[PDB]
Design a protein around this ligand. Structure first.
Ligand SMILES: Cc1cc2nc3c(=O)[nH]c(=O)nc-3n(C[C@H](O)[C@H](O)[C@H](O)COP(=O)(O)O)c2cc1C
Ligand SMILES: Cc1cc2nc3c(=O)[nH]c(=O)nc-3n(C[C@H](O)[C@H](O)[C@H](O)COP(=O)(O)O)c2cc1C
Lengths: 202, 200
């Protein structure tokens, strides 16, 4: 139950504007990419990126998440086929799950498990893990990499093949890597502030 | 349905190591602050922060979120009261002190002009991610925040006058930190406790 003074670099309202403005333009350049280069990336980059995600706030500091980093070609092949076969039942074509150097499979912990077997339930897990995934993608973009935020599909396969315990569930599938040379993204337009931001003034 | 070549910077692995490490340590310095300063912040600062959050990915590009920014000391004080009464069942000065409350709402669905309801996809995680970008933007701006439960939901829904398709997702005061701002001496999990790596 110790305490420490907050060590945070703050800036005058002037420097806060350029910071917030420049950062918005930087993040606005981020786009979901679905065509990856199989170019190699040092694991330490991914480790830092995952670690950067783990710095996110969490309900009661539980940090109820497990980041399963996957570079093994055989596992990625298994996961791909499972994803294609599940989406095939209703593109379903998903070569990016094998071609991307790393699959970051995010799991959410509904509860922690202690040595004595008892279960200490976590709080606001969906929110906490979601925020961490936000930090993940923000870090991926900071590294100069691209990603494909993807549904954790199929959940049961991902659960087994990664051998994660029953307290955990797949939250998000995130292939990561360089973009392909001929990579293209859809000409999408993001909502303007009038459509997303309501303001109650004095 | 047009298409654009991806326009993004590429670094060598080493320049990636640097930036990935440089960004981790910067983000490690972020802490939940519960003691705020009443120092006024330009509305435009938080406008950028909210739009930064809005650049987040979303299921089917629906962007199912509404960021309700509250500076009105009167509504901030009413939100404070109801929050305390709710948490009383078993204390929140920051909800008034912080110059802004960013109440994030999630949209279960969109309502078309013809009154039809077009359902959204993976709203919880989409908005959660967006809230991640929000806190990243806040930290980038040298500001601090208190990620907080959206309680009570019915009250926040009513007083902020949001439609049925929306529900409170998170409440976050935003502002400068207090002078003698103390944070709990917490220690984050290490690589071993949160990261499982499958090599070849
Ligand atoms: C929770 C979530 C799940 C997603 N699942 C998929 C998916 O299964 N397949 C896919 O191609 N894209 C998926 N996406 C990516 C979105 O379609 C994409 O972010 C959206 O089209 C907007 O594009 P942008 O992120 O580049 O701005 C997902 C995004 C989110 C946030
Ligand atoms: C989804 C979510 C809900 C939270 N709700 C509260 C809350 O209701 N009250 C509070 O004091 N802190 C709340 N927090 C903040 C956490 O308690 C805090 O982030 C945690 O103690 C770890 O501290 P850190 O974020 O500085 O690393 C919440 C955080 C998250 C992610």
């Amino acid at each position: 139950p110790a305490f420490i003074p907050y060590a945070g670099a703050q800036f005058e309202p002037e420097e806060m504007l350029s910071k917030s403005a420049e950062y918005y333009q930087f993040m606005d350049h981020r786009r979901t990419v679905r065509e990856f280069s199989n170019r190699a990336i040092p694991l330490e980059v991914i480790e830092n990126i995952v670690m950067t995600a783990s710095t996110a706030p969490s309900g009661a500091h539980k940090q109820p998440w497990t980041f399963v980093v996957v570079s093994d070609p055989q596992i990625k092949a298994k996961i791909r086929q499972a994803a294609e076969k599940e989406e095939f039942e209703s593109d379903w074509h998903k070569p990016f799950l094998e071609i991307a150097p790393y699959l970051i499979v995010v799991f959410r912990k509904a509860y922690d498990v202690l040595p004595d077997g008892t279960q200490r339930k976590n709080y606001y897990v969906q929110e906490s893990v979601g925020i961490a995934c936000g930090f993940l993608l923000a870090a991926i973009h900071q590294a100069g990499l691209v990603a494909l935020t993807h549904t954790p599909s199929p959940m049961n396969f991902l659960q087994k093949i990664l051998q994660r315990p029953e307290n955990e569930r797949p939250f998000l599938l995130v292939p990561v890597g360089y973009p392909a040379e001929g990579a293209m993204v859809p000409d999408l337009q993001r909502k303007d502030k009038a459509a997303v931001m309501v303001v109650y003034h004095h």
